[PDB]
Amino acid sequence: PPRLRSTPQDELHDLLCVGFGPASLAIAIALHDALDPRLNKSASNIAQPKICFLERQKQFAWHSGMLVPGSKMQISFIKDLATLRDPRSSFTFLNYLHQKGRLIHFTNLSTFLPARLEFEDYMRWCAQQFSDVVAYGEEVVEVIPGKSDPSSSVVDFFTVRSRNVETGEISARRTRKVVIAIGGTAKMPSGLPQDPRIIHSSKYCTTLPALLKDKSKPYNIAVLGSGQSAAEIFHDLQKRYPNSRTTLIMRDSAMRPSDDSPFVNEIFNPERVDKFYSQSAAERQRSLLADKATNYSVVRLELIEEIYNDMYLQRVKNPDETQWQHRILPERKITRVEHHGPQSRMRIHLKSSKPKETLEVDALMVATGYNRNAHERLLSKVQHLRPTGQDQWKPHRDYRVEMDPSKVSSEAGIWLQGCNERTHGLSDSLLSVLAVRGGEMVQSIFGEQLERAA
Amino acid sequence: PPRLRSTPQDELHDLLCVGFGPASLAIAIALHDALDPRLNKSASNIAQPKICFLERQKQFAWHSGMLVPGSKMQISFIKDLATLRDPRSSFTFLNYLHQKGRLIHFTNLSTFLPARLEFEDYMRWCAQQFSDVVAYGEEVVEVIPGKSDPSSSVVDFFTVRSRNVETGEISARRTRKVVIAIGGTAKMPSGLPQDPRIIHSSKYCTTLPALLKDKSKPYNIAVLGSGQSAAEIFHDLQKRYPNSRTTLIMRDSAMRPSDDSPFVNEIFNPERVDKFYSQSAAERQRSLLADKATNYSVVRLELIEEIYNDMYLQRVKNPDETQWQHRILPERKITRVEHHGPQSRMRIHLKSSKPKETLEVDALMVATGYNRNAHERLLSKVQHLRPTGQDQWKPHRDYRVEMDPSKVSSEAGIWLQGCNERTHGLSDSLLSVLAVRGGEMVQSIFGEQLERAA
Amino acid sequence: PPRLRSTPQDELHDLLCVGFGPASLAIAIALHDALDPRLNKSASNIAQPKICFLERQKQFAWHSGMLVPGSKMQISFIKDLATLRDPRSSFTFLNYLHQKGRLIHFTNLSTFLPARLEFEDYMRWCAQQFSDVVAYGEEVVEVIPGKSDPSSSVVDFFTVRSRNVETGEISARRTRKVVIAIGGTAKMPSGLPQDPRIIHSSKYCTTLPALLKDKSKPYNIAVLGSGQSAAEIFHDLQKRYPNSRTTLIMRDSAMRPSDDSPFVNEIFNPERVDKFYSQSAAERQRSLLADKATNYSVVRLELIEEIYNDMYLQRVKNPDETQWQHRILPERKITRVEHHGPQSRMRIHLKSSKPKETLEVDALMVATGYNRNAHERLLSKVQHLRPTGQDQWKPHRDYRVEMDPSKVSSEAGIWLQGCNERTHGLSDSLLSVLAVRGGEMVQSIFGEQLERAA
Amino acid sequence: PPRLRSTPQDELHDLLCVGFGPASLAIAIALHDALDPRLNKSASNIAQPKICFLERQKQFAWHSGMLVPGSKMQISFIKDLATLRDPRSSFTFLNYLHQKGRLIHFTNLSTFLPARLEFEDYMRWCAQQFSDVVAYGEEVVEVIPGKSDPSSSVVDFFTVRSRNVETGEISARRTRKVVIAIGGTAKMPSGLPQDPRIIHSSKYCTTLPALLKDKSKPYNIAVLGSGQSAAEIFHDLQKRYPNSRTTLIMRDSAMRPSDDSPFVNEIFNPERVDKFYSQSAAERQRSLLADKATNYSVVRLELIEEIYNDMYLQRVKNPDETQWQHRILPERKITRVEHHGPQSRMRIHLKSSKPKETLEVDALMVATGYNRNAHERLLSKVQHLRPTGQDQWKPHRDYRVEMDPSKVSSEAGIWLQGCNERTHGLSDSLLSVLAVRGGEMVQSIFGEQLERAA
Ligand SMILES: Cc1cc2nc3c(=O)[nH]c(=O)nc-3n(C[C@H](O)[C@H](O)[C@H](O)COP(=O)(O)OP(=O)(O)OC[C@H]3O[C@@H](n4cnc5c(N)ncnc54)[C@H](O)[C@@H]3O)c2cc1C
Ligand SMILES: Cc1cc2nc3c(=O)[nH]c(=O)nc-3n(C[C@H](O)[C@H](O)[C@H](O)COP(=O)(O)OP(=O)(O)OC[C@H]3O[C@@H](n4cnc5c(N)ncnc54)[C@H](O)[C@@H]3O)c2cc1C
Ligand SMILES: Cc1cc2nc3c(=O)[nH]c(=O)nc-3n(C[C@H](O)[C@H](O)[C@H](O)COP(=O)(O)OP(=O)(O)OC[C@H]3O[C@@H](n4cnc5c(N)ncnc54)[C@H](O)[C@@H]3O)c2cc1C
Ligand SMILES: Cc1cc2nc3c(=O)[nH]c(=O)nc-3n(C[C@H](O)[C@H](O)[C@H](O)COP(=O)(O)OP(=O)(O)OC[C@H]3O[C@@H](n4cnc5c(N)ncnc54)[C@H](O)[C@@H]3O)c2cc1C
Ligand SMILES: N[C@@H](CCCC[NH3+])C(=O)O
Ligand SMILES: N[C@@H](CCCC[NH3+])C(=O)O
């Protein structure tokens, strides 16, 4: 039973991981498993690797701003952080349930889709077992190249600088290898102005109740978007604020269901990463477009049906749609936001989305998705180590970015996780392949040491 | 297009119906249909029958105390008040939806089970078309035999006395024929005492909010029973009073699902009334017991699953069941109720139901079903017209009760509706056969007149 | 109760309909209903219109080549040929079931989706009531303009010439107004050669058993396509020929589910035809593309799941996919068909569909859809009556094609049905709006006469 | 990684298990797991126990006579032979799928209910890992008491005699402890005569095709019963013999659905065995009756719906039920079977089951369940070791039968498995608690040795 011990800050690490979300957690789990002589017989002959995870949050949390009450996983629990790699792992969802005394009780639900609350707790339970090698409240701000021989022209380590979120102090740690697994940042439409009453979906549960404190007051609340987050928020607002008037604004004509049909869904199989990666740029782009309805701007059928039913019940009570407490406004775009008025309410102007009315609202929830380019800011000072004229980070199949072999030692490298959809497929940003990917990553990074034991 | 005109109070009626609930409404609809030359070609040759319906409520309503938000019909909309007799009828659910401008919208729900709110409105829409022949706010208090020749020993009419619910005045109407369609009365366990805080399920929506006025207060509310009403209330309380502590008390070990499987469910077919009626007393009793799970002490599967899921989510948050906000207490019976205390809360003592704890609650909802014997109080003064030594009303196949042929003229009679489960089957008290039964009833009562036209 | 009587062949008709499929049948039903004084009170004052339907089949049939055993409707039974226009109509699906003694039995299925076999019989039952005004075994071959004054330059009638399918004789009928409701013709890929062993899906049930007579023989049968017809055939072959080796060839990567989600599905509402028609050419094209997954190249989820399950069971028995009895070959196109060999089997050559193997098969089923341009062949001799320079038939909102007002009298006209997707929407070729459309069509064609009664 | 080695026939065993079905297999798995130092840290200090399993079949098989094509498990795969005891076990269903290369593929089915074919293979894969300690083709015929000191009056071992199914030779093995896990024997109604054409459901797949060799011939085949086996066979016959005329005979009025609702289903939780066992004889009997619909004379809802649908399709084709190819004959009992006729068909006489027709059939399938009393025949010679006057085997909570402490040494004992419903609950004969029970059994039998290591 291996327990990963901490490395002193001042020592050269074998690996430093930026972020301790699901993607990094799955690597921590895979490494534990690779070192467990109960699962990997060769691990009897294997000194502990010097590893550290840096996480900006104060403790493990999973999209806490969107832990909407009643919200469910959109993925089978079998695709947890260990099972698809090894069902014998102690880090499986079912083993978690066993450890909690809930296994028989979950079984009686006959569901593959746990509440997001439950799956977060599963990952929290997993994450707590690595507390000795994780530094929370640490926001990585840059990765700097290092040379053990400064007079040479070869880079063989990296310095990772992080800011303490409480004290603001900068700490440095040196490592041979870096993983960047920082997820995404809130995507806001460029046309919207900054305002406390305009809030991205990622901050829904955490910041909206601070703005609208009275759950009984008749607030007007708009929601922009038509994907899963938009539908979840729109539906939740009606429960959370029973006397409110909610409006869903979308440029599309309707909410559309996610495609989870079994043949299409095979694009998410771990085996398929090889097939997707080995295609051309054009084929990968075309494939992404063809399968878009599996993940992007789509809503789970069950939720669409529930919302539609709520709308129909409003029709039963009142045939005049303009008098409905909760409304959906399709094929529309925001053209102007008035937010300097002495009123508590902003004034939102709407036009057709085809190439109209005015709304007075207390808050606008913006469910417009994420960008996954934040790693570029962290890596700006290592850009010069890329091969000449390359202005994009190119991840290999094993997620290690390409660098000039004559500038960077074979012992040093940087891996990207969760931002590689374009090269690795639609499963990249999701939970789908994390168990298997974690195992691949451990092989890629710690292969040499693991072979000496093997 | 026939429109039933009112009969003056002082005139001898052909028919007087006690109650204007679903059962009487289906008779009104069938009579309209029988007189509609568009549906019944013979009706061209057919004077209007002198008819009146007496209803104690101020206006049409359908189990208003149990119009729980979100509650659904447990029966296909095809089994409405007309369709199974004639799909061409203007009183079909689909024609109602067409008249309302909702037909296409309902179609898009892909559901056979409308909200109870919607189905009530359907029946209200139907009922409003008979407002000229219905006297609301009139509670029938007795049915008295009458003799057009008082010196004779033959009864040939009945006087129906009703009390105005507002003024308390007694009005009489004389009729040749009487229908009693008064549904059921609240069944309370004999062991429980009378108290404003102890309320039958039938009075849930109408009287509980008057008792517990603050929807935010942390009330303790118990629910007794394990049938559909108990589950509906238990589930609704958690929505209506978010900070409340609810407890479901049942003598059974678990909530059990209603059987709606297709072969068993055929007992509800209109054709099957003939088969059920023609069996012996023992066979009818045995059949009722064998099929009990179709109607009695059962909960719709979907609702059991929802409640169970809510319970599991409580387990996720807290593994200690005694700390759960909402609890179910199986295999238990109330033995004592303390309700004279200076406290606002009653003290409910519990023991095992096999041949324990104490609860402090602000209200006890009692979901213990209905009796259907209230017609006996109304008919006590006509009992002597039954054949000698008969101490039970015996309905024929056509629902007309047996009377001594030498005491009662062939032109006079009394019909029972909705209280005949023992002779007619499990569909008797339900909506299942009302369309067809209404048609049979019109034939039984108005056959002679309808034949002259035929 | 109106019964449409036949018009002698030699008389000038008010209307002549080409085709007696669902679209023409819905017009016949609407006309009956408009003339029924039981449904339309004004019809008491209304001489019978002189009408005739010409149908090339020997008797009413509905896609008989695709009456696959077990195949189901993809549309709610509420969207039958009358209900959405008038639920009181005797031509509703529910009234049909009542007339058949099956209403209670269908109700117990709890399904909105009847077997295609059942829905065909419903339409057959409807169609048989118009046998006096339908000429079967008559294939319309041309529509010719006529002038009651031949020296004038104004057209005021049309001659319809039809070929007797048995005798080959040409018959003519003259009418003021023509409806063309001829559905679609089999679409075959241009690259495939003509061969008795290459059969379009439309001829599956009728012609394939004549080719492959022994249901026990181990035939190799390929299926080309990935829409509903392809999946239905692929699945059925495995039942019909238990020892056969079936192959599904598709250029797409996977079978994709049809979108029947409630918000998107509203594009099929009758009310929406007005909204769709009133858009620009670009907006209509964009809208058609956006909603394509509702109808084109899609398979019902349930069927995809069944086929996938069958595939998984093959995996259980044998992990080597190349040995599977039934296989799916995605992302492939046929490049060559060898069919001159002394062998009973054709040789099908396959390549990637991205811009491989060889199959030896006894039959190739081609499920590649339909064209709806066959009306152009029938109307070639009336093209000159279109406004100058117009080389496309332009249907108005009411389906009447545009003609030069100075060449064609106001009393004469031609209507198109079922080929108008581009102007009227995705519901045009389907059953979705037929009841309502039939009513609109009767108003458009017989408005003048119906107003005199009104 | 422990591998159980064989014990020579002539050595005194620690344990001898009669039967190698699911129940014994779960004990073998639990013992392996208890000895696995990877799962049980104490097992590092633990000589191998001398164990042997005797199985009458030639190789592992699971109800092979009822491996009906398409038949599914009625239990969640989580309730496999290891998971509920330890999800880390290599004997879990998911680990089996991983070892087979099918884990991702099963995941994509979104089902908790594998095909019986698949679950048998899972158990076969498990069973093959114990081939060194299992003797197949050995039918145990008696258990005889033994005394290491024959002049003493204390029994301290047992001799198990088994017959080789091929050679007929009797072999003996001596053991301290015996487990009897022999499942059930076919229950036939006493009124039916012996005939090759009258076959119990347990022999359906294995022996019926030998009798009715021509799958195309129009055989008449009757099925008696109304539980899961009856429905499965009735449905399968229609597929297997497409031209046959099948009849389902039942004494009940209808097929009834199994209750798998979540609250009731908790009776199957492993924890609940303690609660059930600790009740009185009357309470246990009453509890068994109350929950009967979970297991006995019930059919999975989905299958009832399918069969009902098939019946409705027959109604569509022909409204005359007496002409239906496949029929159900409710509320009936067989009174006479004529089977001496020169005809190939037997003549079955039917009467009402309430306290009729004749059928001519080629075969009668009898789906009338199992008895679980066969252990009494094997134990007749050890009956005298029970406490005085005890004429029933009384299993303790830990499944060890009560014996006179002064006649039987503490080191010797006999355990019963799968025949203990009356004392242990409805989960006893099923797969529900096998993983946990296997663990309890290993503790009960090998506790002393396992503690020395602990
Ligand atoms: C509301 C919601 C629901 C979802 N549901 C599902 C689902 O059901 N199934 C599914 O497959 N996928 C789902 N997803 C997709 C989601 O991306 C993955 O579940 C998962 O979060 C990916 O993990 P990650 O580690 O790549 O990114 P994240 O989960 O975002 O984790 C990245 C971590 O890095 C930390 N970090 C960021 N920047 C820094 C820095 N500079 N220094 C230090 N630490 C930093 C962040 O605090 C965060 O903890 C969902 C996404 C959202 C938003
Ligand atoms: C909450 C609830 C939900 C149900 N849901 C369903 C369902 O989904 N499907 C189904 O098939 N069945 C259902 N039922 C069964 C129900 O009995 C029938 O739907 C229906 O109410 C039977 O109609 P009825 O006219 O016989 O009785 P009621 O509906 O009770 O109508 C009787 C009427 O008589 C009036 N009345 C009583 N006494 C007098 C008097 N002395 N003088 C004058 N008027 C009087 C009453 O005010 C009432 O209006 C439900 C029952 C309940 C309580
Ligand atoms: C297998 C299949 C299943 C389908 N299922 C559904 C469904 O579930 N729901 C749905 O909404 N839609 C469905 N459709 C769409 C289908 O187009 C409509 O159901 C319907 O057939 C449209 O009717 P129509 O009259 O426009 O065309 P058709 O049904 O093709 O009828 C046209 C008629 O015109 C006749 N005809 C053609 N040419 C001539 C001529 N020269 N002279 C005389 N007569 C002629 C033909 O014989 C035919 O009877 C399905 C289509 C197919 C192929
Ligand atoms: C068709 C069918 C389907 C079922 N499906 C399910 C399901 O989905 N879920 C569920 O929980 N339960 C199910 N059951 C219940 C079933 O009892 C259990 O799944 C399981 O078979 C119990 O295992 P067992 O070892 O107690 O008995 P068995 O499975 O009968 O095994 C007993 C073994 O002992 C052997 N044996 C018998 N006598 C002797 C002898 N004298 N000498 C040597 N060997 C002997 C037999 O050959 C057999 O291999 C099903 C039962 C049947 C019949
Ligand atoms: N299942 C019954 C109705 C039961 C109603 C229970 N409240 C039917 O089909 O008519
Ligand atoms: N429902 C039971 C299994 C019943 C099996 C019936 N053959 C369980 O969950 O364990």
PDB file of N, CA, C and O in Angstrom, chain A residues 97 101-102 105-106 108-109 115 117-118 308-309 312-313 315-317, chain B residues 97 101-102 105-106 108-109 115 117-118 308-309 312-313 315-317 319:
ATOM      1  N   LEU A  97     -18.306   3.899  -3.047  1.00  0.00           N
ATOM      2  CA  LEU A  97     -19.631   3.609  -2.491  1.00  0.00           C
ATOM      3  C   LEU A  97     -19.578   2.543  -1.401  1.00  0.00           C
ATOM      4  O   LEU A  97     -20.299   2.637  -0.398  1.00  0.00           O
ATOM      5  N   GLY A 101     -20.523   2.904   2.634  1.00  0.00           N
ATOM      6  CA  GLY A 101     -21.677   2.146   3.114  1.00  0.00           C
ATOM      7  C   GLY A 101     -22.925   2.387   2.279  1.00  0.00           C
ATOM      8  O   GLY A 101     -24.042   2.164   2.747  1.00  0.00           O
ATOM      9  N   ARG A 102     -22.732   2.822   1.032  1.00  0.00           N
ATOM     10  CA  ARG A 102     -23.843   3.160   0.139  1.00  0.00           C
ATOM     11  C   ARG A 102     -23.979   2.261  -1.093  1.00  0.00           C
ATOM     12  O   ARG A 102     -24.858   2.495  -1.932  1.00  0.00           O
ATOM     13  N   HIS A 105     -27.324   0.649  -1.647  1.00  0.00           N
ATOM     14  CA  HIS A 105     -28.320   1.700  -1.808  1.00  0.00           C
ATOM     15  C   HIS A 105     -28.263   2.336  -3.175  1.00  0.00           C
ATOM     16  O   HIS A 105     -29.297   2.676  -3.748  1.00  0.00           O
ATOM     17  N   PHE A 106     -27.064   2.478  -3.727  1.00  0.00           N
ATOM     18  CA  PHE A 106     -26.929   3.039  -5.069  1.00  0.00           C
ATOM     19  C   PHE A 106     -27.445   2.035  -6.095  1.00  0.00           C
ATOM     20  O   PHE A 106     -28.130   2.400  -7.049  1.00  0.00           O
ATOM     21  N   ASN A 108     -29.810  -0.048  -5.831  1.00  0.00           N
ATOM     22  CA  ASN A 108     -31.277  -0.007  -5.861  1.00  0.00           C
ATOM     23  C   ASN A 108     -31.908   1.163  -6.639  1.00  0.00           C
ATOM     24  O   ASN A 108     -33.123   1.190  -6.845  1.00  0.00           O
ATOM     25  N   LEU A 109     -31.085   2.126  -7.055  1.00  0.00           N
ATOM     26  CA  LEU A 109     -31.553   3.250  -7.864  1.00  0.00           C
ATOM     27  C   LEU A 109     -31.687   2.877  -9.334  1.00  0.00           C
ATOM     28  O   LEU A 109     -32.399   3.551 -10.083  1.00  0.00           O
ATOM     29  N   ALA A 115     -25.892  11.929  -9.166  1.00  0.00           N
ATOM     30  CA  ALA A 115     -25.978  13.380  -8.994  1.00  0.00           C
ATOM     31  C   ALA A 115     -24.576  13.964  -9.044  1.00  0.00           C
ATOM     32  O   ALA A 115     -23.624  13.337  -8.575  1.00  0.00           O
ATOM     33  N   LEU A 117     -23.431  16.316  -7.330  1.00  0.00           N
ATOM     34  CA  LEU A 117     -23.068  16.402  -5.916  1.00  0.00           C
ATOM     35  C   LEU A 117     -22.370  15.126  -5.440  1.00  0.00           C
ATOM     36  O   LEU A 117     -21.333  15.197  -4.782  1.00  0.00           O
ATOM     37  N   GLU A 118     -22.936  13.968  -5.786  1.00  0.00           N
ATOM     38  CA  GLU A 118     -22.360  12.683  -5.393  1.00  0.00           C
ATOM     39  C   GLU A 118     -21.026  12.411  -6.090  1.00  0.00           C
ATOM     40  O   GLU A 118     -20.083  11.927  -5.459  1.00  0.00           O
ATOM     41  N   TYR A 308     -40.176  21.719 -21.371  1.00  0.00           N
ATOM     42  CA  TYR A 308     -41.312  21.769 -22.290  1.00  0.00           C
ATOM     43  C   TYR A 308     -42.636  21.522 -21.552  1.00  0.00           C
ATOM     44  O   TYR A 308     -43.623  22.227 -21.775  1.00  0.00           O
ATOM     45  N   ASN A 309     -42.648  20.526 -20.673  1.00  0.00           N
ATOM     46  CA  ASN A 309     -43.824  20.231 -19.858  1.00  0.00           C
ATOM     47  C   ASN A 309     -44.241  21.402 -18.968  1.00  0.00           C
ATOM     48  O   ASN A 309     -45.426  21.727 -18.881  1.00  0.00           O
ATOM     49  N   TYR A 312     -45.936  23.852 -21.173  1.00  0.00           N
ATOM     50  CA  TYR A 312     -47.293  23.423 -21.499  1.00  0.00           C
ATOM     51  C   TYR A 312     -48.264  23.694 -20.353  1.00  0.00           C
ATOM     52  O   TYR A 312     -49.391  24.117 -20.593  1.00  0.00           O
ATOM     53  N   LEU A 313     -47.829  23.453 -19.116  1.00  0.00           N
ATOM     54  CA  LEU A 313     -48.669  23.741 -17.948  1.00  0.00           C
ATOM     55  C   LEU A 313     -49.014  25.230 -17.832  1.00  0.00           C
ATOM     56  O   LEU A 313     -50.119  25.582 -17.428  1.00  0.00           O
ATOM     57  N   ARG A 315     -49.370  27.079 -20.484  1.00  0.00           N
ATOM     58  CA  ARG A 315     -50.390  27.221 -21.528  1.00  0.00           C
ATOM     59  C   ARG A 315     -51.789  26.826 -21.044  1.00  0.00           C
ATOM     60  O   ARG A 315     -52.777  27.489 -21.375  1.00  0.00           O
ATOM     61  N   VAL A 316     -51.863  25.748 -20.269  1.00  0.00           N
ATOM     62  CA  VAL A 316     -53.115  25.307 -19.649  1.00  0.00           C
ATOM     63  C   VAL A 316     -53.742  26.424 -18.796  1.00  0.00           C
ATOM     64  O   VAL A 316     -54.941  26.695 -18.899  1.00  0.00           O
ATOM     65  N   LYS A 317     -52.918  27.068 -17.970  1.00  0.00           N
ATOM     66  CA  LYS A 317     -53.373  28.142 -17.085  1.00  0.00           C
ATOM     67  C   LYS A 317     -53.706  29.434 -17.833  1.00  0.00           C
ATOM     68  O   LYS A 317     -54.618  30.165 -17.446  1.00  0.00           O
TER      69      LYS A 317
ATOM     70  N   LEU B  97     -59.441  19.875 -26.131  1.00  0.00           N
ATOM     71  CA  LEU B  97     -58.132  20.442 -26.467  1.00  0.00           C
ATOM     72  C   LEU B  97     -58.171  21.259 -27.755  1.00  0.00           C
ATOM     73  O   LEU B  97     -57.515  22.305 -27.853  1.00  0.00           O
ATOM     74  N   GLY B 101     -57.478  25.327 -28.275  1.00  0.00           N
ATOM     75  CA  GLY B 101     -56.302  25.703 -29.058  1.00  0.00           C
ATOM     76  C   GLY B 101     -55.030  25.034 -28.564  1.00  0.00           C
ATOM     77  O   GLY B 101     -53.928  25.516 -28.826  1.00  0.00           O
ATOM     78  N   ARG B 102     -55.183  23.905 -27.866  1.00  0.00           N
ATOM     79  CA  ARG B 102     -54.051  23.192 -27.272  1.00  0.00           C
ATOM     80  C   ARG B 102     -53.785  21.801 -27.856  1.00  0.00           C
ATOM     81  O   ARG B 102     -52.879  21.100 -27.388  1.00  0.00           O
ATOM     82  N   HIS B 105     -50.310  21.133 -29.110  1.00  0.00           N
ATOM     83  CA  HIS B 105     -49.382  21.283 -27.997  1.00  0.00           C
ATOM     84  C   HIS B 105     -49.408  20.093 -27.070  1.00  0.00           C
ATOM     85  O   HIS B 105     -48.370  19.684 -26.551  1.00  0.00           O
ATOM     86  N   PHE B 106     -50.582  19.505 -26.871  1.00  0.00           N
ATOM     87  CA  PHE B 106     -50.681  18.318 -26.027  1.00  0.00           C
ATOM     88  C   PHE B 106     -50.040  17.131 -26.739  1.00  0.00           C
ATOM     89  O   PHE B 106     -49.330  16.333 -26.128  1.00  0.00           O
ATOM     90  N   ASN B 108     -47.554  17.083 -28.693  1.00  0.00           N
ATOM     91  CA  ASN B 108     -46.093  17.166 -28.566  1.00  0.00           C
ATOM     92  C   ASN B 108     -45.504  16.717 -27.216  1.00  0.00           C
ATOM     93  O   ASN B 108     -44.284  16.608 -27.075  1.00  0.00           O
ATOM     94  N   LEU B 109     -46.368  16.472 -26.230  1.00  0.00           N
ATOM     95  CA  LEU B 109     -45.936  15.970 -24.926  1.00  0.00           C
ATOM     96  C   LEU B 109     -45.694  14.467 -24.946  1.00  0.00           C
ATOM     97  O   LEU B 109     -44.991  13.940 -24.080  1.00  0.00           O
ATOM     98  N   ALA B 115     -52.107  16.262 -16.507  1.00  0.00           N
ATOM     99  CA  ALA B 115     -52.131  16.762 -15.131  1.00  0.00           C
ATOM    100  C   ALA B 115     -53.566  16.746 -14.629  1.00  0.00           C
ATOM    101  O   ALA B 115     -54.497  16.995 -15.399  1.00  0.00           O
ATOM    102  N   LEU B 117     -54.965  18.861 -12.799  1.00  0.00           N
ATOM    103  CA  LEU B 117     -55.411  20.229 -13.059  1.00  0.00           C
ATOM    104  C   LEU B 117     -56.044  20.356 -14.447  1.00  0.00           C
ATOM    105  O   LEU B 117     -57.118  20.940 -14.586  1.00  0.00           O
ATOM    106  N   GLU B 118     -55.380  19.799 -15.462  1.00  0.00           N
ATOM    107  CA  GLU B 118     -55.885  19.852 -16.833  1.00  0.00           C
ATOM    108  C   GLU B 118     -57.157  19.021 -17.011  1.00  0.00           C
ATOM    109  O   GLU B 118     -58.097  19.460 -17.678  1.00  0.00           O
ATOM    110  N   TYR B 308     -37.887   7.597  -3.409  1.00  0.00           N
ATOM    111  CA  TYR B 308     -36.708   6.794  -3.088  1.00  0.00           C
ATOM    112  C   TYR B 308     -35.412   7.548  -3.423  1.00  0.00           C
ATOM    113  O   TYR B 308     -34.467   7.558  -2.632  1.00  0.00           O
ATOM    114  N   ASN B 309     -35.380   8.179  -4.592  1.00  0.00           N
ATOM    115  CA  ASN B 309     -34.233   8.987  -5.000  1.00  0.00           C
ATOM    116  C   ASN B 309     -33.949  10.144  -4.043  1.00  0.00           C
ATOM    117  O   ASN B 309     -32.796  10.384  -3.681  1.00  0.00           O
ATOM    118  N   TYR B 312     -32.309   8.670  -1.063  1.00  0.00           N
ATOM    119  CA  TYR B 312     -30.909   8.351  -1.330  1.00  0.00           C
ATOM    120  C   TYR B 312     -30.025   9.594  -1.275  1.00  0.00           C
ATOM    121  O   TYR B 312     -28.918   9.534  -0.747  1.00  0.00           O
ATOM    122  N   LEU B 313     -30.510  10.711  -1.816  1.00  0.00           N
ATOM    123  CA  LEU B 313     -29.758  11.970  -1.758  1.00  0.00           C
ATOM    124  C   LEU B 313     -29.524  12.442  -0.318  1.00  0.00           C
ATOM    125  O   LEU B 313     -28.471  12.990  -0.007  1.00  0.00           O
ATOM    126  N   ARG B 315     -29.152  10.305   2.106  1.00  0.00           N
ATOM    127  CA  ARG B 315     -28.088   9.393   2.538  1.00  0.00           C
ATOM    128  C   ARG B 315     -26.694   9.872   2.122  1.00  0.00           C
ATOM    129  O   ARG B 315     -25.737   9.768   2.897  1.00  0.00           O
ATOM    130  N   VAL B 316     -26.588  10.388   0.901  1.00  0.00           N
ATOM    131  CA  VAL B 316     -25.344  10.978   0.400  1.00  0.00           C
ATOM    132  C   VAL B 316     -24.845  12.102   1.325  1.00  0.00           C
ATOM    133  O   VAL B 316     -23.664  12.146   1.678  1.00  0.00           O
ATOM    134  N   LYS B 317     -25.756  12.993   1.716  1.00  0.00           N
ATOM    135  CA  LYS B 317     -25.426  14.126   2.583  1.00  0.00           C
ATOM    136  C   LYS B 317     -25.144  13.712   4.028  1.00  0.00           C
ATOM    137  O   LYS B 317     -24.308  14.316   4.701  1.00  0.00           O
ATOM    138  N   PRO B 319     -25.086   9.899   6.364  1.00  0.00           N
ATOM    139  CA  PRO B 319     -25.292   8.453   6.503  1.00  0.00           C
ATOM    140  C   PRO B 319     -26.143   8.061   7.722  1.00  0.00           C
ATOM    141  O   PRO B 319     -26.589   6.917   7.807  1.00  0.00           O
TER     142      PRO B 319
END
